[PDB]
Amino acid sequence: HHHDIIDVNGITIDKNAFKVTVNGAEIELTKTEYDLLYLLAENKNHVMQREQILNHVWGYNSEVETNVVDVYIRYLRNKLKPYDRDKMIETVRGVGYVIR
């Protein structure tokens, strides 16, 4: 076990850097979930096609199956659900995903 959060010399450092702040609390993510959320958020109101999300989050050269995007959208929605934030991630069937 590693201490979740450490304070030393007035510096606060969390074991897991990939957290976002919501309602005075924190949602704890993985790198890939965090990068996916960032992408969608930076592209608010602009629908992102699955292949574009794949390129930006997993890499233009990636050998991963494109449906990994759908998998991680589900993981991210599940992370947002306890904070009633999941509906911000909308599916555009046959295109991709968007935050409005």
Ligand SMILES: [Mg+2]
């Ligand atoms: Mg951080």
Ligand SMILES: [Mg+2]
């Ligand atoms: Mg943070």
Ligand code: NA
């Ligand atoms: Na969490």
